[PDB]
């Protein structure tokens, strides 16, 4: 039962539980894109 969050979701640097290939942004507390 591991449902990861999406890119347009909220998260924190202390507890980042977002799908892989991403990068939690502490700026807007949202999962940003790891690939540019």
Quote the beta fraction: 15-25%
As a percent range, the share of helical residues equals under 10%
Quote the distance from N terminus to C terminus: 30 Å
Number of helices: 0
- How would you spell out the order of helices and strands? EE
For the sheet with most strands, the description reads: 2 strands, antiparallel
Q: How many strand segments? A: 2
Secondary-structure-derived class:
mainly beta
The largest sheet has its strands arranged as 1-2
Tell the overall outline.
globular
* Rounded radius of gyration (Å): 9 Å
3D architecture notes:
This protein is an all-beta fold. It contains no helices and 2 strands. The protein has strands at residues 22-25, 30-33. Strands 1-2 form a two-stranded antiparallel ribbon. β1 (22-25) and β2 form a beta hairpin. It is globular and about 30 Å long. The termini are far apart. It is classed as toxin. The entry lists the keywords Spider toxin, Sodium channel modulator, Inhibitor cystine knot, disulfide rich peptides, toxin.
Quick take:
By secondary structure, this protein is mainly β.
Write the layout of secondary structure elements.
Elements: E1 22-25, E2 30-33
Name the features:
36 residues; mainly beta; two-stranded antiparallel sheet; 2 strands; 0% helix; toxin; Sodium channel modulator; Inhibitor cystine knot; disulfide rich peptides; monomeric
């Amino acid at each position: 039962s591991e449902d990861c969050l999406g890119w347009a979701s909220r998260c924190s640097p202390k507890n980042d539980k977002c799908c892989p290939n991403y990068k939690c942004s502490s700026k807007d507390l949202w999962c940003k894109y790891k690939i540019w």
